[PDB]
Design a protein around this ligand. Structure first.
Ligand SMILES: [K+]
Lengths: 139, 147
DNA sequence: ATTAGTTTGTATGCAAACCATT
DNA sequence: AATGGTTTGCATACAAACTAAT
């Protein structure tokens, strides 16, 4: 099995989902990654940069960059906890909350309308494989 | 009072895709960090080696990237000297890439290492599971490529 | 010593804008 | 004019190397 053809095959699906998300949110000045972050905070309230990394399958140095550039935009806020002043935490600002709320539906539909012509079975059958192989790959 | 139409979580599908994608390509970068080549430069080389010559538009289709992105990757990879850009007299807009001698020697020595760098990620993964992966990828990909 | 983060350097991710060719 | 490509101006990809803080 030519796992190159397999890689490029993901490359294709992956590319198409994320840059669709870019298009849908081009009007609001957000990258697909920004949108990924906002979707992730709006679910978890606060997150360590470290958890973001895990969640977005992304290195610390990149998440670092992204969250800062979001801070400057005034959507997220970083903070440090009294007990342990190393861990940096991320949560919404007022506008952050207001955005997530106003666009909750659009963010939800960007990803969802990508696969509309698929059936739920066809979707979950993919998720099963993904989770399966993903596990096989990890050791 | 809102009635938010709940559905199926395609955000989950993106993040998993992302994870499987990420681990695959950045594994390849480490595999070729000694060699001074990014995984993108390697994908190019694997394509040029298989197809002999390719136009920038053909590369976009193969790597699923945008003309400007790929224009960059080639120009930089020409600076290292593994890749010649040329134009055919019959339509001079089109720009093709193919190997230099140096880049052809590379592609020859390191074929096996490029082949096993991808295949070793799915070493622990056996045949059914891959066929399934392809099956589902190809199918869902067909449905997204409608609108 | 150690771990969480941030910075730095270089290659990219894109659309839009710009250019050569048809 | 209309493409195929290239440039540009950003936000990012990582890993190393630096910086707090435990
Ligand atoms: K990038």
């Amino acid at each position: 099995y030519d796992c190159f053809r397999i890689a490029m095959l993901l490359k294709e699906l992956y590319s198409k989902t994320m840059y669709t998300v870019e298009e849908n949110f081009k009007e609001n000045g957000l990258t697909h990654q920004q949108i990924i972050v906002i979707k992730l905070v709006a679910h978890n309230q606060e997150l360590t940069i470290s958890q973001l990394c895990d969640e977005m399958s992304l290195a610390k140095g990149t998440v670092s960059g992204i969250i800062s550039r979001l801070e400057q935009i005034g959507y997220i806020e970083k903070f440090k906890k009294s007990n342990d002043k190393r861990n940096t935490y991320v949560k919404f600002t007022t506008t952050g909350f207001e955005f997530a709320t106003n666009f909750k539906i659009k963010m939800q539909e960007s990803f969802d309308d990508i696969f509309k012509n698929c059936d739920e079975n066809e979707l979950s059958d993919l998720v099963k494989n993904l989770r399966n192989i993903l596990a096989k790959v990890k050791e």
